[PDB]
Amino acid sequence: MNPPPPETSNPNKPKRQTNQLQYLLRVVLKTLWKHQFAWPFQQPVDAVKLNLPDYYKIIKTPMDMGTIKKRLENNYYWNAQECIQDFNTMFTNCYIYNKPGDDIVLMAEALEKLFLQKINELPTEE
Numbered sequence: 001m002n003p004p005p006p007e008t009s010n011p012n013k014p015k016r017q018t019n020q021l022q023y024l025l026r027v028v029l030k031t032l033w034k035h036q037f038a039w040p041f042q043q044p045v046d047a048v049k050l051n052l053p054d055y056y057k058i059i060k061t062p063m064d065m066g067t068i069k070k071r072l073e074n075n076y077y078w079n080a081q082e083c084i085q086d087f088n089t090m091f092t093n094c095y096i097y098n099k100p101g102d103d104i105v106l107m108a109e110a111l112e113k114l115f116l117q118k119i120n121e122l123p124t125e126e
């Protein structure tokens with residue numbers, strides 16, 4: 001069994017649409033999403049189909065770019081830090097679960113390098 005996915009909709013949660021969050025969608029998410037190594041990270045890990053029965057025993061804070069994309073498109077966030085944390089959670093999960101050197105780790109590292117370069121130029125708030 002897979003767990004329920006992370007929340008992407010919560011009408012109780014206060015929301016903003018801001019230039020930093022717009023950057024996170026238009027520059028950061030879109031840059032990583034189109035990458036040749038994006039595909040393992042475009043949706044929640046399906047531990048059943050991938051035969052990783054211990055994945056959610058080890059990973060208790062799942063995150064993926066499919067979830068982040070939905071959160072950004074549906075204006076789920078209050079600030080950029082929340083979204084940046086989601087990306088970092090996704091990368092960290094990969095490094096925590098997988099054997100050092102594995103293809104998936106190299107893929108995460110390539111995406112993380114781009115992520116860091118884009119976040120380095122996060123625009124100042126308007």
Ligand SMILES: Cn1c(=O)n(C)c2cc(C(N)=O)ccc21
Binds near residue numbers: 040045097098104
């Ligand atoms: C070990 N592992 C991970 O840690 N992630 C994120 C994975 C994604 C896929 C996949 N086929 O999407 C397959 C295996 C994966």
